[PDB]
């Protein structure tokens, strides 16, 4: 009966933390988008060539 409860207890936590890591992932992807387009933002020290190659 002890491990019978331990099973369900771990299961609910698993199901919660799956979606919580999913939320972490979606918060992470757009962060990486912002960081990428921000690293590509300051490439204007060159002319129009440095823009499009960035």
């Amino acid at each position: 009966n002890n491990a019978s409860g331990k099973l369900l207890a771990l299961d609910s936590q698993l199901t919660n933390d799956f979606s919580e890591k999913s939320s972490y992932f979606q918060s992470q992807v757009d962060k990486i988008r912002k960081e990428a387009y921000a690293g590509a933002a300051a490439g204007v020290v060159a002319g129009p060539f440095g823009l499009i190659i960035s």
């Binding site: 921000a38 933002a41 300051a42 020290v45």
Partner: peptide, 26 residues
């Protein structure tokens, strides 16, 4: 001198990155 102006352009882009980060984080 070409060495020196590329040397100074490095610290130029460094400080521009510093200022751009300090602005964009705000």
């Amino acid at each position: 001198k070409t060495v020196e102006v590329v040397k100074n352009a490095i610290e130029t882009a460094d400080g521009a990155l510093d200022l751009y980060n300090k602005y964009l984080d705000q």
